[PDB]
């Protein structure tokens, strides 16, 4: 089910038998080149230098404690201590059929966990922007993957629905009785007497006053109604039942600042309440004063990220929390989490992980503006995708838009938006590019969609006998068959990487190499016929699992499929 995992524990045990410590790293990775096998163990030389050994020498001794019959057709040593592993065709055929039996493609369902995923997290009365856009795509993908792996995934849309800014906004709403336009006019008129009533409305909302709280509800509702619509178009799994905004934590904030002083916390600096963290000393060596409650009395983004962590453990019972937030907030998160753990609000088991991403830029590095400038309106981005997508899919037209073409342009358009983001490593600044992403040539949503259709057409347009095809025997004899078969089987371990590291681009690179391997399997390897039905069925069974694997793999990234 997980070849790398299986091999990795066997190599570690051999090593251990050779004198290696218990915590040794076999370093079994997928082979870079087919002449090196399916997998190789890379970590011999490190241990060899500490065992007083030649890399080859250890590796050789290792290869004596290593029981790989039935698993690897052959296992040779190479270069300075590498162990190279060619998987046995039997083993491949057995696990390919076996995987063709589960609707899960044999992918294990590990010890279930409650995972909280903090993603998207826009702000009320401000326009949703590309950072939230990225957060939404990457986070949703992680949600889908973890959901497929079996876990109770709790979506936590951490909306910025609290802050001094509302006093101004709510006042402007009152006088009124374009999200961008609303804030600006309130801003100008607050500055342009507005200001007193608006600070005084910030106090009034802080305290009960249902008149105000309804107004705050009405504002939150306008922003979240619009965003949900964006979420819908993006076929993202976020729903309004998943909104867990900063507001949610207000009631517990004085309970926390209170607890923290009981250890733990200083009224030092200019009044206010600061935790001082020696981990974050100034260059002069002055500890970082992280304010959790101002002299003004109001609380802060830090306070609310503390509560939110404490809450997710104490109340949600998360085993793990994933935060898909822009890289620039990294030390904010590390400061808040530093305080959370010092106060013992969540234990060390239970990760709390910052899955950072980088900025979204335009064609050459400027901060990325939508069509016709403005302040980046995502509905515009999504409109422009579809217009391009529609005109793009116009060629080779015949079937009605209705559900035929229109669903097709939508899959391709929205697919491109997501997949162009997901296919790139999240830590990298992402240079948007219409033409690269809507292409069919490289690692794109449309290329993948195209390939999926090609696989399905190869399969369906032939014959059918589900119950009989399932008794077909899959025999690996060609070298491309063994390669395809092995790639297919690495689907779980790709999933596992994505789920551990939070990097959906690993799957994209998998599904692209996979579709590359099918095309080469299609051309240089004939589909019907040779050994009549014998070999025909095997190849069909491999096109079958490839179809099922692309489908599934793309449904974890949130990317739809057509059949045309
Ligand atoms: N737990 C968190 N701090 N989540 C992220 C909140 C991000 C915030 N909504 C923003 O627009 O920047």
Numbering used by the authors: 1 to 177, 188 to 202, 205 to 576
Passage from the reporting paper:
To better recognize these identity elements, ArgRS possesses an N-terminal domain of roughly 100 amino acids—the Add1 domain, which is unique among aaRSs.
E. coli ArgRS contains the N-terminal additional domain (Add1, residues 1–112), the catalytic domain (113–382) including two insertion domains (Ins1, residues 164–221, and Ins2, residues 258–311), and the C-terminal additional domain (Add2, 383–577). The refined structure contains the whole sequence except residues Q178–A187, D203–E204 and the C-terminal M577. The crystallographically invisible residues (178–187 and 203–204) are part of the insertion domain 1 (Ins1) as defined by Cavarelli and co-workers. Although 2.5 mmol/L ATP was always present in the crystal growth solution, ATP molecule is not visible in the electronic density map. Three residues in the region (A121, N123 and H132) formed hydrogen bonds to the main chain atoms of L-arginine and adopted similar orientations as observed in yeast structures (Asn153 and Gln375 of yArgRS), independent of tRNA binding. The side chain recognition motif, which dictates the specificity of the enzyme, contains three conserved residues (D118, Y313, D317) making direct H-bonds (or salt bridges) to the guanidinium moiety of arginine. Another residue R324 formed two hydrogen bonds with D118, stabilizing the orientation of the latter. In particular, Y313 of eArgRS acts as a gate-keeper: keeping the binding pocket open in the absence of arginine via the Y313-W162 H-bond, while locking the bound arginine in position after rotameric rotation.
